[PDB]
PDB file of all heavy atoms in Angstrom:
ATOM      1  N   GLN X 262      -2.573  -3.544  24.740  1.00  8.97           N
ATOM      2  CA  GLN X 262      -2.094  -2.259  25.243  1.00  8.97           C
ATOM      3  C   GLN X 262      -0.815  -2.396  26.058  1.00  8.97           C
ATOM      4  O   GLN X 262      -0.830  -2.238  27.278  1.00  8.97           O
ATOM      5  CB  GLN X 262      -3.189  -1.577  26.061  1.00  8.97           C
ATOM      6  CG  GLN X 262      -4.496  -1.476  25.290  1.00  8.97           C
ATOM      7  CD  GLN X 262      -5.593  -0.762  26.053  1.00  8.97           C
ATOM      8  OE1 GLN X 262      -5.447  -0.446  27.234  1.00  8.97           O
ATOM      9  NE2 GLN X 262      -6.707  -0.504  25.374  1.00  8.97           N
ATOM     10  N   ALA X 265       5.621   0.930  28.623  1.00  8.40           N
ATOM     11  CA  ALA X 265       4.671   1.586  27.727  1.00  8.40           C
ATOM     12  C   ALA X 265       5.316   2.783  27.050  1.00  8.40           C
ATOM     13  O   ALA X 265       5.085   3.044  25.861  1.00  8.40           O
ATOM     14  CB  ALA X 265       3.420   2.025  28.502  1.00  8.40           C
ATOM     15  N   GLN X 266       6.144   3.508  27.823  1.00  7.17           N
ATOM     16  CA  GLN X 266       6.875   4.693  27.384  1.00  7.17           C
ATOM     17  C   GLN X 266       7.893   4.374  26.303  1.00  7.17           C
ATOM     18  O   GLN X 266       8.013   5.100  25.309  1.00  7.17           O
ATOM     19  CB  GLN X 266       7.564   5.370  28.571  1.00  7.17           C
ATOM     20  CG  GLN X 266       8.312   6.635  28.172  1.00  7.17           C
ATOM     21  CD  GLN X 266       7.369   7.801  28.039  1.00  7.17           C
ATOM     22  OE1 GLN X 266       6.511   8.059  28.884  1.00  7.17           O
ATOM     23  NE2 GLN X 266       7.487   8.490  26.971  1.00  7.17           N
ATOM     24  N   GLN X 269       6.646   3.684  22.606  1.00  2.00           N
ATOM     25  CA  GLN X 269       6.215   4.919  21.951  1.00  2.00           C
ATOM     26  C   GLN X 269       7.391   5.757  21.435  1.00  2.00           C
ATOM     27  O   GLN X 269       7.338   6.282  20.316  1.00  2.00           O
ATOM     28  CB  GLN X 269       5.335   5.739  22.895  1.00  2.00           C
ATOM     29  CG  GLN X 269       4.709   6.956  22.235  1.00  2.00           C
ATOM     30  CD  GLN X 269       3.509   6.590  21.371  1.00  2.00           C
ATOM     31  OE1 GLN X 269       2.870   5.555  21.577  1.00  2.00           O
ATOM     32  NE2 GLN X 269       3.199   7.442  20.398  1.00  2.00           N
ATOM     33  N   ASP X 270       8.461   5.892  22.230  1.00  2.00           N
ATOM     34  CA  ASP X 270       9.640   6.654  21.803  1.00  2.00           C
ATOM     35  C   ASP X 270      10.390   5.971  20.671  1.00  2.00           C
ATOM     36  O   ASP X 270      10.923   6.639  19.777  1.00  2.00           O
ATOM     37  CB  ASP X 270      10.590   6.875  22.978  1.00  2.00           C
ATOM     38  CG  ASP X 270      10.027   7.817  24.011  1.00  2.00           C
ATOM     39  OD1 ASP X 270       8.939   8.383  23.767  1.00  2.00           O
ATOM     40  OD2 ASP X 270      10.684   8.005  25.055  1.00  2.00           O
ATOM     41  N   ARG X 273       9.702   6.988  17.112  1.00  2.00           N
ATOM     42  CA  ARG X 273      10.379   8.145  16.529  1.00  2.00           C
ATOM     43  C   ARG X 273      11.567   7.704  15.682  1.00  2.00           C
ATOM     44  O   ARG X 273      11.877   8.329  14.658  1.00  2.00           O
ATOM     45  CB  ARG X 273      10.844   9.121  17.606  1.00  2.00           C
ATOM     46  CG  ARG X 273       9.774   9.596  18.555  1.00  2.00           C
ATOM     47  CD  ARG X 273      10.362  10.724  19.361  1.00  2.00           C
ATOM     48  NE  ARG X 273       9.420  11.346  20.279  1.00  2.00           N
ATOM     49  CZ  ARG X 273       9.768  12.261  21.178  1.00  2.00           C
ATOM     50  NH1 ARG X 273      11.033  12.649  21.264  1.00  2.00           N
ATOM     51  NH2 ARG X 273       8.856  12.799  21.974  1.00  2.00           N
ATOM     52  N   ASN X 281       3.437   6.696  10.407  1.00  2.00           N
ATOM     53  CA  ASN X 281       2.118   7.059   9.922  1.00  2.00           C
ATOM     54  C   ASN X 281       1.240   5.831   9.748  1.00  2.00           C
ATOM     55  O   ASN X 281       0.013   5.924   9.869  1.00  2.00           O
ATOM     56  CB  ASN X 281       2.251   7.812   8.601  1.00  2.00           C
ATOM     57  CG  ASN X 281       2.921   9.163   8.774  1.00  2.00           C
ATOM     58  OD1 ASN X 281       2.541   9.950   9.632  1.00  2.00           O
ATOM     59  ND2 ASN X 281       3.907   9.446   7.927  1.00  2.00           N
ATOM     60  N   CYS X 284      -0.020   4.655  13.127  1.00  2.00           N
ATOM     61  CA  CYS X 284      -1.040   5.569  13.601  1.00  2.00           C
ATOM     62  C   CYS X 284      -2.345   5.362  12.854  1.00  2.00           C
ATOM     63  O   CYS X 284      -3.422   5.440  13.454  1.00  2.00           O
ATOM     64  CB  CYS X 284      -0.564   7.004  13.418  1.00  2.00           C
ATOM     65  SG  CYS X 284      -1.630   8.138  14.248  1.00  2.00           S
ATOM     66  N   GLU X 287      -3.959   2.565  14.797  1.00  2.00           N
ATOM     67  CA  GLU X 287      -4.620   2.992  16.035  1.00  2.00           C
ATOM     68  C   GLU X 287      -5.899   3.793  15.823  1.00  2.00           C
ATOM     69  O   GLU X 287      -6.718   3.875  16.744  1.00  2.00           O
ATOM     70  CB  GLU X 287      -3.656   3.837  16.874  1.00  2.00           C
ATOM     71  CG  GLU X 287      -2.536   3.065  17.536  1.00  2.00           C
ATOM     72  CD  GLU X 287      -1.561   3.965  18.266  1.00  2.00           C
ATOM     73  OE1 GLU X 287      -1.335   5.100  17.788  1.00  2.00           O
ATOM     74  OE2 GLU X 287      -1.038   3.548  19.324  1.00  2.00           O
ATOM     75  N   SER X 288      -6.093   4.391  14.652  1.00  2.00           N
ATOM     76  CA  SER X 288      -7.312   5.144  14.393  1.00  2.00           C
ATOM     77  C   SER X 288      -8.469   4.258  13.956  1.00  2.00           C
ATOM     78  O   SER X 288      -9.613   4.723  13.934  1.00  2.00           O
ATOM     79  CB  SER X 288      -7.049   6.234  13.346  1.00  2.00           C
ATOM     80  OG  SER X 288      -6.881   5.679  12.054  1.00  2.00           O
TER      81      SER X 288
ATOM     82  N   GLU W 106      -9.112   4.014  28.243  1.00  2.00           N
ATOM     83  CA  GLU W 106      -7.703   4.161  27.861  1.00  2.00           C
ATOM     84  C   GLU W 106      -7.120   5.484  28.352  1.00  2.00           C
ATOM     85  O   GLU W 106      -6.393   6.174  27.634  1.00  2.00           O
ATOM     86  CB  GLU W 106      -7.523   4.010  26.350  1.00  2.00           C
ATOM     87  CG  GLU W 106      -8.102   2.725  25.785  1.00  2.00           C
ATOM     88  CD  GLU W 106      -7.904   2.620  24.288  1.00  2.00           C
ATOM     89  OE1 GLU W 106      -6.739   2.680  23.840  1.00  2.00           O
ATOM     90  OE2 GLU W 106      -8.908   2.489  23.559  1.00  2.00           O
ATOM     91  N   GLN W 268       9.620  16.333  25.333  1.00  2.00           N
ATOM     92  CA  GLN W 268       9.152  15.140  26.020  1.00  2.00           C
ATOM     93  C   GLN W 268       7.838  15.375  26.756  1.00  2.00           C
ATOM     94  O   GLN W 268       6.963  14.506  26.745  1.00  2.00           O
ATOM     95  CB  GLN W 268      10.227  14.567  26.926  1.00  2.00           C
ATOM     96  CG  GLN W 268      10.255  13.062  26.786  1.00  2.00           C
ATOM     97  CD  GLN W 268      11.003  12.596  25.553  1.00  2.00           C
ATOM     98  OE1 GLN W 268      10.792  13.081  24.427  1.00  2.00           O
ATOM     99  NE2 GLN W 268      11.952  11.697  25.781  1.00  2.00           N
ATOM    100  N   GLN W 271       4.733  15.551  24.576  1.00  2.00           N
ATOM    101  CA  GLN W 271       4.524  14.196  24.071  1.00  2.00           C
ATOM    102  C   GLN W 271       3.877  13.275  25.112  1.00  2.00           C
ATOM    103  O   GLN W 271       2.978  12.491  24.780  1.00  2.00           O
ATOM    104  CB  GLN W 271       5.864  13.624  23.602  1.00  2.00           C
ATOM    105  CG  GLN W 271       5.789  12.277  22.897  1.00  2.00           C
ATOM    106  CD  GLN W 271       5.369  12.401  21.442  1.00  2.00           C
ATOM    107  OE1 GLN W 271       5.541  13.453  20.823  1.00  2.00           O
ATOM    108  NE2 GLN W 271       4.838  11.318  20.882  1.00  2.00           N
ATOM    109  N   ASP W 272       4.333  13.341  26.373  1.00  2.00           N
ATOM    110  CA  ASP W 272       3.769  12.522  27.457  1.00  2.00           C
ATOM    111  C   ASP W 272       2.349  12.936  27.821  1.00  2.00           C
ATOM    112  O   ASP W 272       1.507  12.090  28.150  1.00  2.00           O
ATOM    113  CB  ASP W 272       4.652  12.616  28.697  1.00  2.00           C
ATOM    114  CG  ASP W 272       6.004  11.978  28.500  1.00  2.00           C
ATOM    115  OD1 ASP W 272       6.217  11.358  27.435  1.00  2.00           O
ATOM    116  OD2 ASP W 272       6.856  12.112  29.403  1.00  2.00           O
ATOM    117  N   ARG W 275      -0.888  11.159  26.355  1.00  2.00           N
ATOM    118  CA  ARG W 275      -1.483   9.962  26.950  1.00  2.00           C
ATOM    119  C   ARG W 275      -2.675  10.333  27.830  1.00  2.00           C
ATOM    120  O   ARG W 275      -3.673   9.603  27.884  1.00  2.00           O
ATOM    121  CB  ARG W 275      -0.474   9.153  27.747  1.00  2.00           C
ATOM    122  CG  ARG W 275       0.723   8.809  26.994  1.00  2.00           C
ATOM    123  CD  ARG W 275       1.531   7.790  27.782  1.00  2.00           C
ATOM    124  NE  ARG W 275       2.736   7.392  27.029  1.00  2.00           N
ATOM    125  CZ  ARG W 275       3.689   6.623  27.520  1.00  2.00           C
ATOM    126  NH1 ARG W 275       3.525   6.180  28.771  1.00  2.00           N
ATOM    127  NH2 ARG W 275       4.755   6.329  26.835  1.00  2.00           N
ATOM    128  N   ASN W 283      -5.385  10.011  18.557  1.00  2.00           N
ATOM    129  CA  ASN W 283      -5.355   9.616  17.156  1.00  2.00           C
ATOM    130  C   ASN W 283      -5.448  10.812  16.213  1.00  2.00           C
ATOM    131  O   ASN W 283      -4.929  10.748  15.094  1.00  2.00           O
ATOM    132  CB  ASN W 283      -6.472   8.609  16.882  1.00  2.00           C
ATOM    133  CG  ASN W 283      -6.239   7.272  17.579  1.00  2.00           C
ATOM    134  OD1 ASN W 283      -5.164   6.681  17.472  1.00  2.00           O
ATOM    135  ND2 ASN W 283      -7.245   6.799  18.305  1.00  2.00           N
ATOM    136  N   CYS W 286      -2.105  12.707  16.020  1.00  2.00           N
ATOM    137  CA  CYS W 286      -1.213  11.834  15.283  1.00  2.00           C
ATOM    138  C   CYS W 286      -1.591  11.770  13.809  1.00  2.00           C
ATOM    139  O   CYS W 286      -0.711  11.784  12.941  1.00  2.00           O
ATOM    140  CB  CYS W 286      -1.299  10.471  15.964  1.00  2.00           C
ATOM    141  SG  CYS W 286      -0.322   9.096  15.466  1.00  2.00           S
ATOM    142  N   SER W 287      -2.892  11.718  13.508  1.00  2.00           N
ATOM    143  CA  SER W 287      -3.349  11.784  12.122  1.00  2.00           C
ATOM    144  C   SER W 287      -2.918  13.084  11.461  1.00  2.00           C
ATOM    145  O   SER W 287      -2.684  13.130  10.248  1.00  2.00           O
ATOM    146  CB  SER W 287      -4.869  11.638  12.055  1.00  2.00           C
ATOM    147  OG  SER W 287      -5.336  11.792  10.726  1.00  2.00           O
ATOM    148  N   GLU W 289       0.008  14.874  12.232  1.00  2.00           N
ATOM    149  CA  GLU W 289       1.429  14.737  11.914  1.00  2.00           C
ATOM    150  C   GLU W 289       1.688  13.939  10.638  1.00  2.00           C
ATOM    151  O   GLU W 289       2.779  14.050  10.064  1.00  2.00           O
ATOM    152  CB  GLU W 289       2.135  14.071  13.106  1.00  2.00           C
ATOM    153  CG  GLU W 289       2.283  14.975  14.341  1.00  2.00           C
ATOM    154  CD  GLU W 289       2.886  14.274  15.558  1.00  2.00           C
ATOM    155  OE1 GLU W 289       2.626  13.065  15.750  1.00  2.00           O
ATOM    156  OE2 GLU W 289       3.621  14.929  16.327  1.00  2.00           O
ATOM    157  N   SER W 290       0.720  13.144  10.176  1.00  2.00           N
ATOM    158  CA  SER W 290       0.880  12.377   8.947  1.00  2.00           C
ATOM    159  C   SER W 290       0.597  13.201   7.700  1.00  2.00           C
ATOM    160  O   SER W 290       0.902  12.751   6.592  1.00  2.00           O
ATOM    161  CB  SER W 290      -0.045  11.152   8.959  1.00  2.00           C
ATOM    162  OG  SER W 290      -1.398  11.515   8.758  1.00  2.00           O
TER     163      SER W 290
END
Side-chain angles (χ1 to χ4, degrees):
Chain X
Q262 307 182 352
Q266 182 80 47
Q269 187 78 24
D270 291 354
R273 306 190 177 173
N281 293 310
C284 191
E287 288 176 326
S288 72
Chain W
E106 306 180 57
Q268 223 80 311
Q271 187 80 24
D272 293 354
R275 306 191 178 173
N283 292 309
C286 183
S287 176
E289 288 175 326
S290 73

